[PDB]
């Protein structure tokens with residue numbers, strides 16, 4: 038791996054901790070302005086039985102995070118140990134864990150329950166994150182609650198860029214393209230046409246919305262993955278989550294339009310959610 | 320998905336159970352001669368978040384097992400639910416878990432004798448010999464991919480990466496990119512080829528795991544720097560519970576030059592000999 042000083046972090050200053058392959062760890066001086074300050078962070082590294090592809094994915098994930106730039110709703114890359122030793126990708130620690138676990142643990146006893154506003158606010162932040170990503174020519178391809186992290190201050194953060202790509206780094210029409218994308222969050226064009234665009238992420242955003250309003254429920258319950266695409270082609274779509282407004286449901290439905298261009302853009306989603314969120318506050 | 324009556328099993332006769340994605344299950348009449356007897360089996364199916372590649376792998380696995388044929392040291396394929404519903408690959412239930420856990424469980428849960436270890440190795444060589452005779456390359460040989468029945472019978476499993484020796488994209492950069500690096504033959508990566516001799520390299524690693532009682536290969540060496548070391552001649556040291564002879568066999572399996580490694584046929588002959596001596 039090439040040397041990249043701006044991001045390199047001294048191995049001797051990193052104390053690997055318990056597992057979260059990801060593990061918690063302490064990094065001394067990772068924050069330039071606090072040279073002696075130890076910071077709690079997360080570290081992703083290869084497993085002992087990792088494959089060559091696992092490595093290329095880890096490297097790819099790290100580089101995308103470098104080119105993306107910093108944003109409020111995207112997990113932050115803090116540094117990396119890429120020389121004379123195993124590859125370590127150091128990223129910001131999200132104390133509340135992944136969004137799916139977060140929501141399930143806050144389900145009504147039937148922790149601190151989620152208010153309707155919290156759910157709308159969560160969706161809004163994530164829409165902003167995706168809006169930014171798209172402006173950076175980046176397609177995540179793996180959007181899902183399990184891939185969202187929440188910070189101690191409940192800030193939503195898009196994560197796991199293990200499958201993300203530059204808009205131009207997709208091999209259109211090849212049978213092997215998009216073969217490693219979870220089917221239940223995947224846009225029909227991804228497999229049918231073997232393409233991938235920001236609008237493909239919008240479809241994924243929709244399922245994420247459903248996951249959010251079902252408080253961490255599994256999409257297409259009872260429907261096996263090998264039967265899904267037949268049903269989608271036939272017009273099947275998940276049902277309205279309970280306690281979800283028809284308006285938010287229509288938003289989900291709009292994300293699930295078969296024609297990519299008929300789906301809203303992340304910018305449109307952001308403006309709409311912003312309105313719904315503001316009007317709920319008032 | 321095509322209909323294969325021969326292997327198709329009725330879903331209504333299958334009752335899924337606890338997790339072992341693989342789950343335990345009870346199958347009624349899976350044994351044709353005993354139409355009313357429920358058999359405890361193991362079922363492999365897709366996870367809710369499975370990918371397209373996860374599906375073709377499962378299909379490939381099922382199809383390979385069909386082609387392979389039956390052998391005492393190969394997890395037996397019992398049937399499959401492929402129509403109108405999720406794909407279920409029903410295989411023989413191995414009550415004692417995978418070899419890696421088995422071995423670590425009985426670390427000085429009844430301690431393994433040198434003979435047991437040799438026997439374990441012998442059985443696996445036999446399975447791989449047959450596998451090889453059927454023109455099949457496993458590609459993912461490892462203790463974690465060996466199951467052990469109630470009678471301590473060794474069984475090679477997880478054919479999720481197995482292929483027909485003739486179905487390999489020779490020299491393509493994307494070839495063999497999903498094989499655990501630490502069990503991988505050097506040529507598998509440097510030249511993008513895979514042959515039976517590539518499997519014997521992995522067998523060598525499997526042997527080291529066995530005699531170390533489930534030890535982790537290349538301890539302390541990250542996968543990132545393993546191939547450079549391998550290219551330089553680095554090889555694992557002899558396991559303490561191992562005889563020099565058996566270690567030499569491992570070294571043989573790890574010869575740089577593929578054609579210079581023994582064949583599974585030769586391994587079985589040598590192992591049988593050693594086993595016959597050890598038991599006498």
Ligand SMILES: Nc1ncnc2c1ncn2[C@@H]1O[C@H](COP(=O)(O)OP(=O)(O)CP(=O)(O)O)[C@@H](O)[C@H]1O
Pocket residue numbers: 057058059079081112128129130131132134135183184186196197199
């Ligand atoms: N920065 C972080 N802070 C807190 N928890 C984190 C974290 N990074 C990862 N985790 C935890 O680890 C889980 C898996 O992380 P990630 O999605 O990056 O996994 P992964 O890329 O290794 C494998 P897969 O593709 O199977 O998820 C997260 O859902 C979360 O629970």
Ligand SMILES: Nc1ncnc2c1ncn2[C@@H]1O[C@H](COP(=O)(O)OP(=O)(O)CP(=O)(O)O)[C@@H](O)[C@H]1O
Pocket residue numbers: 339340341361363394410411412413414416417463464466476477479
């Ligand atoms: N027939 C069987 N009987 C008993 N246990 C079984 C079994 N098949 C699988 N298992 C258990 O499940 C584990 C995983 O099995 P397998 O290796 O087939 O997994 P897999 O292909 O689903 C995933 P991976 O490729 O990550 O291992 C085994 O190591 C064993 O503990």
Ligand SMILES: [Mg+2]
Pocket residue numbers: 183184197
């Ligand atoms: Mg993930």
Ligand SMILES: [Mg+2]
Pocket residue numbers: 197199200
């Ligand atoms: Mg990942």
Ligand SMILES: [Mg+2]
Pocket residue numbers: 463464477
């Ligand atoms: Mg396995």
Ligand SMILES: [Mg+2]
Pocket residue numbers: 477478479480
């Ligand atoms: Mg497998």
